[PDB]
Amino acid sequence: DCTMYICGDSTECSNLLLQYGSFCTQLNRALTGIAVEQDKNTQEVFAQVKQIY
């Protein structure tokens, strides 16, 4: 959480961070892209077959 990590529990700081805009969103877009592919990495390795033998 890039609003929480930068400005802890602070309204005055969080209002200043919102002037920086998409920075907080683009970091999580890359971390989510990792979180999605890490479940995809596990999906590609351990499940190659539809049937559980």
Binding site: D1, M4, G8, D9
Partner: protein
């Protein structure tokens, strides 16, 4: 400073929150996954 005691300051605003939803074109109903918590705050 008045009576002598040691108070830990624990930050508020704790635990992850996720949004489980179908596309807004489908429905506006959402499920909210609260990580790191039991069912209490809501």
């Amino acid at each position: 400073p008045q009576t002598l005691e040691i108070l830990d300051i624990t930050p508020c605003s704790f635990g992850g929150v996720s949004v489980i939803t179908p596309g807004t074109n489908t429905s506006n109903q959402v499920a909210v996954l609260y990580q790191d918590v039991n069912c209490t705050e809501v």
